[PDB]
């Protein structure tokens, strides 16, 4: 399997920018907290500190140079995360610093559900990839709350030992969930029993800022110790550590597509790794005019070549990038 590791590590050798946008305003903070594609990858949404969710049509963006959002939604507070529904093309969730979990029609801007149970800042939301009605959120109140789109109040809650910074549903089960906690660990639960975690992954020295599913069998986590960590669902300790980037403080973003991992860095750059090798595959350096990349996401086009992703730094600069 070594030769396949080689061919996969040398698959890409260059990067090409396709577009450049600005999330901003009065020279204020314009950090982009979240970037997510809709189900068909026709549109992508951008959310950050300016309290605004901006939606863009992908095909319109990568043509001409002048980029106005297809729909812009003003919010009450600063936004930390967004997530599109895998079942409903217009359903798009958002979490803010008030602890609110708002369900949006990403186009009409209407509000169908406003969930207000979190008592402190909410860091992450995510839709269940195998249940259309379910979604989840995690907050600084050491709580992971489960929501149903057909109900006003939460259906269940997992009580953690410290702050919850990121949540994610498994892409292979409607009952498996994972979240990264301030206790430097990654917790893995079967929502049927929440007493009672399935696994607690130890290895990080700082709070687990990010946690994504590479697949149904492998998780990738990002923590503020300049470390990415690859875990197996069955092994309580990491399979491989990815170093080379600088992530000691901020939510710099983490994204995974198939066999490739991308994360931001505090030298104003995006780093790309292959999940079976610890060394950096390649790096893209943002221009500048203390700046850190803040959000990344793969354009995971079903049945195709995930050669393109979107990254965004703390300056509000957003770039669509194709791997050559």
């Amino acid at each position: 399997e070594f030769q396949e590791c080689l061919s996969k590590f040398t698959r890409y050798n260059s990067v090409r920018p396709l577009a450049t946008l600005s999330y901003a305003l009065y020279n204020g903070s314009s950090i982009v907290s979240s970037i997510e594609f809709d189900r068909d990858c026709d549109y992508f949404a951008i959310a950050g500190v300016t309290k605004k969710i901006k939606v863009y049509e992908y095909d319109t963006v990568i043509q001409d140079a002048i980029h106005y959002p297809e729909n812009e939604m003003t919010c009450n507070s600063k936004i930390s995360c967004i997530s599109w529904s895998s079942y409903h093309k217009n359903l798009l969730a958002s979490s803010d610093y008030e602890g609110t979990v708002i369900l949006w029609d990403g186009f009409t801007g209407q509000r169908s559900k406003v969930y207000q149970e979190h008592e402190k800042r909410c860091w992450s939301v995510d839709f269940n990839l195998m249940d259309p009605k379910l979604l989840a959120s995690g907050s600084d109140d050491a709580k992971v709350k489960l929501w149903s789109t057909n109900l006003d109040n939460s259906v269940a809650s997992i009580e953690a030992k410290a702050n919850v910074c990121c949540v994610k549903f498994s892409p292979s089960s409607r009952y498996h969930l994972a979240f990264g906690c301030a206790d430097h660990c990654v917790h893995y639960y079967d929502l049927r029993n929440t007493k009672q975690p399935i696994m607690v992954f130890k290895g990080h020295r700082k709070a687990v800022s990010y946690a994504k599913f590479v697949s149904g069998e492998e998780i990738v986590s990002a923590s503020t110790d300049s470390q990415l960590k690859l875990w197996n669902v069955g092994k309580p300790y990491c399979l491989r550590s990815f170093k080379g980037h600088i992530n000691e403080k901020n939510f710099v973003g983490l994204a995974s597509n198939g066999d490739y991992i991308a994360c931001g860095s505090e030298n104003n750059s995006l780093y790309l790794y292959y999940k079976g090798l610890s060394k950096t595959l390649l790096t893209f350096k943002f221009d500048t005019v203390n700046e850190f990349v803040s959000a990344v996401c793969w354009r995971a086009l079903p049945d195709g070549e995930s050669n393109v992703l979107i990254a965004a730094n703390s300056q509000g600069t957003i770039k669509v990038l194709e791997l050559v």
Partner: peptide
């Protein structure tokens, strides 16, 4: 500012 990851002691 914002986007500051939390931190646990633990004493």
């Amino acid at each position: 500012s914002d986007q500051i990851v939390p931190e646990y002691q633990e004493d």
